[PDB]
Amino acid sequence: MTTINTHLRETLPKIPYVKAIDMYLMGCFVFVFMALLEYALVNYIFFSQPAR
Amino acid sequence: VFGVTTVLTMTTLSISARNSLPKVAYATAMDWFIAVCYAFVFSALIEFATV
């Protein structure tokens, strides 16, 4: 996601506002980020109870 | 790591690959080849997920 974001960003001007494509890329990034954090949370309480 | 890293390499080759042709709005033949190959890589990974 970071590679995609950095490689497809430099073909535009340095505009401050959030574009639609920037919104979509940040959405995809927060989704995969919360997925990894969710895994971290699953691993945090894996040793104690496997049911949760 | 096989599946995910080959998907990442498919992403790197596709990003590298898009600098060759202009910014046309239709799919070329190389675009179809890259799409089918990416589909095969993704299909291989989901097949691994199933197994």
DSSP string, chain B: -HHHHHHHHHHHHHHHHTTTS---SS--HHHHHHHHHHHHHHHHHHHHHH-
End-to-end Cα, chain B, rounded Å? 15
The backbone torsions φ and ψ at residue B45, rounded to the nearest 5 degrees and listed phi first, read -65, -45
Long-range contacts of B4-13 (CB under 8 A, 24+ apart): B4/B45, B6/B41, B6/B44, B6/B45, B7/B38, B7/B41, B7/B42, B7/B45, B8/A3, B10/B34, B10/B37, B10/B38, B10/B41, B11/A3, B11/A4, B12/A3
Give residue for tokens 């401050």. Answer: A16
Nearest-angstrom CA–CA distance, A9 and A24? 13
Give residue for tokens 């590679």. Answer: A3
User: Which of A4, A21, A25, A39 to mutate: most B Cβ within 10 Å?
Assistant: A4
Query: What residues of chain A lie within 8 A of the CB of B12, using their CB?
Result: 3
Q: How far is CA B27 from the centre of its chain?
A: 14
Q: How far is CA A28 from the centre of its chain?
A: 5
Query: By the CB < 8 Å criterion, does A7 face chain B?
Result: yes
Structure tokens at B38: 């990416």
Closest CA to B13 of A3, A6, A12: A3
Query: By the CB < 8 Å criterion, does A3 face chain B?
Result: yes
Query: What residues of chain B lie within 8 A of the CB of A10, using their CB?
Result: none
Query: By the CB < 8 Å criterion, does A28 face chain B?
Result: no
| Dihedral class, residue A15 (left if φ above 0, else alpha if ψ from -120 to 50, else beta) | beta
Experimental method: cryo-EM
